Nucleic acid binder design. Structure first.
Ligand SMILES: [Zn+2]
Lengths: 198, 81, 126, 58, 150, 159, 341
RNA sequence: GCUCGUAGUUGAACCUGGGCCUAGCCCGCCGGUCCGCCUCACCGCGUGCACUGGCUGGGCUGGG
């Protein structure tokens, strides 16, 4: 049986993550919310909520600190630090309109954030100097970005080309590898924590 | 297939689609400028002309009509806009 | 010819949801179609759509919906009739929605019970 | 070179600043290139890592 | 789908976007209007006018350059055909077929096509009558079609 | 016409007067025009962009010549984005404002893309054959269109 | 008090967020109606309203920090509107009346305005910020505000750093508080990392015309007290080009004022000679830039004696090399001032 | 057997001027303090990058 359940939102739950303390966060089109699922009384009510910043799509939590980035639908990601930030800082490509679908903190190299967007594009972000970094347009839309947990520079995009592209974040000229085996579109990709499987 | 960006097809797949089946339909015909070397006259011809286009006088020709593009005649120049 | 361009659009949506595609090309656009997809997008059965122009609509769908339909004679309906119409059109009262062309616009039956206005039944999805 | 230049367009100024950010991020991943190289060239890899242990130097 | 004979046929003339510029295809709208008026005076149908413009002058559409379409412009300057072009061509075609039938009668395919053309004329004629173009009661038989000819 | 001048209306009208003589050897719409209208409201931060309103047949009279006229209006006057438009007083009017905004380049399509809630974003694409000299003017186009109409649009070349 | 009794009687019960925002709009307009008007009673009335809010708040439910970052966030119960309301009444009253600006009245508000700055709601934070901007200058006879202004300084810097854009109202209110602290109170020192962060955030807000005067007020506030650091030097190297290369006079004059306060204030001969090469090169330099650099030379010759001898000696000869027509008449006035000194 | 055809039936999309209040800033005007000017004096004027307050003066933007 489940440990803790709650009727969180109205619409579907698009993104969801765990904090580094014990608490969990969830996106929707409603706006993101924070719960304490491990408490000596069970509480259904959230302990923080956030609606300003457009329709959010995904979450990604930092490896060490209490920072997390939410990918919104206004073409920006916005970065909160828990316990001393309220609205967060909205980082965006300067003239960007299409929605950012997924967001993923690099767990090895902290303060490097990857994102995909429905411009069939991947975009990077440096959190240390808060600006985007590089943007490449691929041929088909990418559903999900992910990073390698043992090699800090390699990423994988699961894309509507039925395909997985393993890229190098330093040289976006060519794909390091192209996994092609599917029939319909690829919805989710995840590296193994040993970094050698997918 | 299953998911694709339908508001942003590729230009190469858009370009091989028939006329009326591009995302917003549009022509694929063009206009040309034509001079004939003895004359400093600049007649502007449509690519798929049905008229035996004649320059400003001089009972010549400039093109003949076909089933598709107008066949420009002989030695003639053409910039295309 | 089906003059019901809403029915042609909804037939295309049902064909894509059966065939497992991830977008469509609704070739004749309208405004009632845009309001219909606005309600479907409020209730999350369709991801994201754009109206491009020659126009047509590109509708990113999540793969969450089962059936779209139009009620072709468009019968008028009061609230006390609306409860029985909902429980006779939908498989369950908590699954799917009935679309209404009211005096307050085009909305679902829960928004109609919120805003206390009746109207004609135009379509439904679930 | 203490003389100021003309202010460029906003797109070109943004492009130069983000090129500088790309060079900084490439430096902070070139600090990882050597360990990625040794992990891909080594003969036997042992997971979990020794540096991630919750009793590392005890 | 192409009315009478079976066969879809997607042969259609495309119209581009931005109903304003084609800038490098110069010439003021007034000049284009005066050329159209000259063509109308010489005695040419709006479609023939459009074809002539396509052939020679720097035009895309009159509706783009000028505020109005050709037929609309002709109507404003009172230089429009008696029977709106298409209808006139159909009645000419019907007259030609009737004259062919008179020359040789047994040709049943020609008689069938005559019937088709008459039906198409009636189809056009009803809708022209509805849009207040043509005066009420419009016969399209040999008693009146022959008198019309041109 | 309609105006008694502001501080910069007489300056831009003096520029239109000074382009007659002491220069080229080109004048077709320069002598049949008077003081018309102009506006000076910011674009971005730090920079501004001058717009001038034009009588409605003089828009095609200005489509006759706009190469190097706007170049000398940019260089010789104030070093800011010069922009001509018709003056008007609904959706056809805003369509006209867009297609007279983008003067060398023909717009192709409008994509009104909604989001996963009721919010919607319009985005008008341009022509691919002219890309290099317009992209630094695109935010000025978007900001002048917002300032005149109220609808946020964003300009983008198709890729 | 007949106005605020039915409000309390209503919002004591359970409530939803739309009517919460309704009561917030009502209370801010009550404060605007109050700030136009028998004043010591207004002070004790504000203090009593804040005391009733502190009685009504439950002490188990306090704001807690973020689980991921260890500080407090700047952001349905809506109790904080009464605190916003009361501090806005205090803001209007202590703005308009000088005789209430006493050291003795505000010792009741020094622990009260403490939890006003530390609150996570944006409305009460900007109310507290504008309040402390009005009440910098009170001596308090024992330096009791010398902990409150440390706390307020830390939180204003934190709020600018955590705000998504400095062009928002909360970041601008915090920037006002920081600039009035740097203009008046010499007990509070600035940290170099915080000043580097602020100037790096305000590089483009210097030339943004809507917030130009506020950011240049902050820059003159930094240039008031001596702060020799690389961030201030690197941003004044940018205000140098803002002086000449910008298009309009309203930005050119503010850049002239900032660079001029820099040259009047800051204490090598190599560096000052570099400033003179820069100013002479812009003299050679477009005509609006020539006008602005000529008026900056004029300001230097006016306000400045060895430096007068040097600036006249190096400014006179390229000026007569220059000797468009307005710049020529201005250069004539400049060399007339050179002959006059 | 196919085609045309009338009563009948279904019939494309596109289509919410004026004034008042309000907040923020600017430009300008006005009263006072300080300083300066001039007037024999009375007096007035300049006077907010010296200070302070007002303006149902003008301009831009947001909200009702
Ligand atoms: Zn010739």
């Amino acid at each position: 049986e489940e440990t803790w359940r709650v009727a969180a939102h109205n619409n579907i739950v698009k993104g969801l993550t765990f904090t580094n303390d014990k608490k969990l966060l969830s996106c929707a089109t409603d706006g993101i919310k924070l719960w304490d699922p491990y408490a000596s009384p069970s509480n259904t009510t959230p302990i923080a909520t956030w609606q300003e910043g457009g329709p959010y799509t995904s979450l990604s939590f930092h490896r060490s600190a209490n920072t997390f980035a939410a990918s919104s639908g206004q073409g920006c990601i916005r970065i909160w630090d828990l316990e001393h930030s309220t609205a967060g800082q909205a980082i965006q490509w300067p003239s960007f309109v299409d929605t950012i679908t997924d967001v993923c903190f690099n767990q090895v190299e902290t303060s490097v954030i990857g994102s995909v967007a429905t411009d069939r594009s991947i975009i990077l972000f440096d959190l240390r100097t808060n600006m985007p970094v590089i943007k490449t347009v691929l041929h088909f839309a990418c559903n999900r970005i992910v990073f390698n947990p043992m090699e800090a520079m390699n990423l994988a995009v699961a894309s509507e080309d039925h395909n997985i592209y393993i890229f190098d974040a330093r040289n976006f000229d060519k794909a390091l590898n192209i996994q092609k085996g599917h029939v319909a579109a690829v919805m989710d990709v995840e590296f193994s924590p040993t970094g050698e499987e997918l | 297939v299953l998911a694709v960006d339908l508001l942003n097809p590729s230009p190469a797949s858009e370009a091989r689609k028939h006329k009326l089946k591009t995302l917003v339909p549009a022509p694929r015909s063009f206009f040309m400028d034509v001079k004939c070397p003895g004359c400093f006259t600049i007649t502007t011809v449509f690519s798929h002309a049905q008229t035996v286009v004649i320059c400003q006088g001089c009972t010549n020709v400039l093109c003949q009509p076909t089933g598709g593009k107008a066949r420009l005649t002989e030695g003639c120049s053409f910039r295309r806009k | 010819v089906r003059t019901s361009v809403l029915h042609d659009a909804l037939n295309s949506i049902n064909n894509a949801e059966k065939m497992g595609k991830r977008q469509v090309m609704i070739r004749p656009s309208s405004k009632v179609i845009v309001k219909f997809l606005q309600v479907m997008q409020r209730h999350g059965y369709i991801g994201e759509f754009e109206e491009v122009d020659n126009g047509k609509i590109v509708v990113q769908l999540n793969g969450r919906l089962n059936k779209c339909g139009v009620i072709s004679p468009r019968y008028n309906v009061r609230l006390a009739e609306l409860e029985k119409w909902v429980t006779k059109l939908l498989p369950a009262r908590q699954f799917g929605y009935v679309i209404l062309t009211t005096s307050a616009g085009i909305m679902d039956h829960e928004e109609a019970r919120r805003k206390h206005v009746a109207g004609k039944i135009i379509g439904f999805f679930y | 070179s203490k003389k100021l230049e003309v202010p460029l367009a906003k797109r070109q100024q943004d492009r130069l600043m983000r090129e500088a950010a790309y060079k900084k991020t490439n430096e902070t991943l070139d600090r990882w290139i050597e360990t990625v190289k040794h992990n891909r060239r080594a003969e036997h890899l042992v997971f979990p890592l020794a540096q991630n242990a919750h009793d590392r130097g005890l | 789908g192409r009315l009478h004979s079976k066969g879809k046929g997607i042969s259609a003339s495309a119209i581009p976007y931005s109903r304003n510029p084609p800038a490098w295809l110069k010439t003021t709208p007034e000049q284009v209007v005066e050329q159209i008026c000259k063509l109308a005076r010489k005695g040419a149908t709006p479609s023939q006018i459009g074809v002539i413009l396509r052939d020679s002058h720097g035009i895309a559409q009159v509706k783009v350059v000028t505020g109005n379409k050709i037929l609309r412009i002709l109507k404003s300057n009172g230089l429009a055909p008696d029977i709106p072009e298409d209808l006139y061509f159909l009645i000419k075609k019907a007259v030609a077929v009737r004259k062919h039938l008179e020359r040789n009668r047994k040709d049943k395919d020609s008689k069938f096509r005559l019937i088709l053309i008459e039906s198409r004329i009636h189809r056009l004629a009803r809708y022209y009558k509805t849009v207040g173009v043509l005066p009420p009661t419009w016969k399209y038989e040999s008693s009146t079609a022959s008198t019309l000819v041109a | 016409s309609r105006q008694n001048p502001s501080d910069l209306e007489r300056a831009i009208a003096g520029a239109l007067y000074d382009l007659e003589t002491n220069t080229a050897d080109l004048k077709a719409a320069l002598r049949p025009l008077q003081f018309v209208s102009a506006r000076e409201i910011e674009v971005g931060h730090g920079k501004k962009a001058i717009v001038i309103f034009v009588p409605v047949p003089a828009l095609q009279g200005f489509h006759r010549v706009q190469q190097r006229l706007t170049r000398e209006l940019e260089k010789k006057f104030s070093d800011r984005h010069v922009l001509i438009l018709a003056a008007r007083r609904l959706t056809a009017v805003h369509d006209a404002i867009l297609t007279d905004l983008v003067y060398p380049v023909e717009i192709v399509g409008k994509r009104l893309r909604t989001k996963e809630d009721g919010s919607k974003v319009l985005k008008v694409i341009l022509d691919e054959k002219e890309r290099g000299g317009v992209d630094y003017r695109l935010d000025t186009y978007s900001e002048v269109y917002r300032r005149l109409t109220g609808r946020n649009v964003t300009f983008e070349f198709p890729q | 008090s007949e106005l605020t009794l039915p409000l309390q009687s209503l919002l004591m019960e359970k409530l939803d967020l739309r009517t919460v925002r309704k009561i917030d709009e009502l209370l801010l307009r009550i404060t605007k109606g109050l700030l136009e008007n028998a004043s010591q009673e207004v002070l004790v009335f504000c203090y009593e309203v804040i005391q009733e809010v502190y009685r009504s708040q439950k002490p188990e439910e306090l704001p807690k920090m973020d689980p991921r970052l260890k500080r407090f966030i700047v952001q349905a119960k809506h109790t904080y509107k009464m605190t916003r309301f009361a501090i806005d009444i205090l803001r209007a009253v202590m703005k308009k009346h000088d005789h209430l600006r006493t050291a003795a009245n505000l010792i009741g508000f020094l622990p009260v305005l403490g939890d006003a700055v530390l609150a996570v709601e944006e409305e009460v934070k900007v109310s507290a910020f504008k309040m402390l901007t009005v009440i910098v200058k009170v001596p308090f006879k024992n330096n009791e505000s010398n902990g409150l202004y440390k706390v307020a300084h830390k939180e204003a810097i934190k709020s600018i750093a955590m705000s998504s854009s400095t062009q928002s109202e909360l970041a601008q209110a915090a920037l006002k508080l920081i600039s009035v602290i740097l203009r008046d109170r010499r007990d509070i020192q600035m940290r170099e990392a915080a000043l580097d962060m602020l100037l790096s955030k305000l590089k483009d807000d210097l030339t943004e015309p809507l917030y130009r005067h506020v950011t240049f007020n902050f820059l003159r506030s930094v240039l008031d007290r001596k702060l020799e650091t690389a961030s201030v030097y690197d941003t004044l190297d940018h205000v140098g080009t803002v002086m000449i290369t910008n298009d309009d006079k309203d930005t050119r004059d503010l850049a002239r004022g900032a660079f001029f306060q820099f040259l009047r204030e800051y204490p090598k001969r190599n560096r000052w000679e570099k400033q003179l090469k820069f100013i002479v090169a812009n003299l050679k330099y477009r005509e609006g830039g020539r006008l602005s650099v000529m008026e900056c030379i004029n300001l230097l010759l006016k306000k400045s004696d060895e430096f007068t001898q040097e600036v006249a000696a190096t400014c006179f000869i390229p000026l007569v090399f220059v000797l468009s027509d307005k710049c020529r008449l201005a250069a004539g006035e400049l060399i007339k001032e050179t002959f006059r000194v």
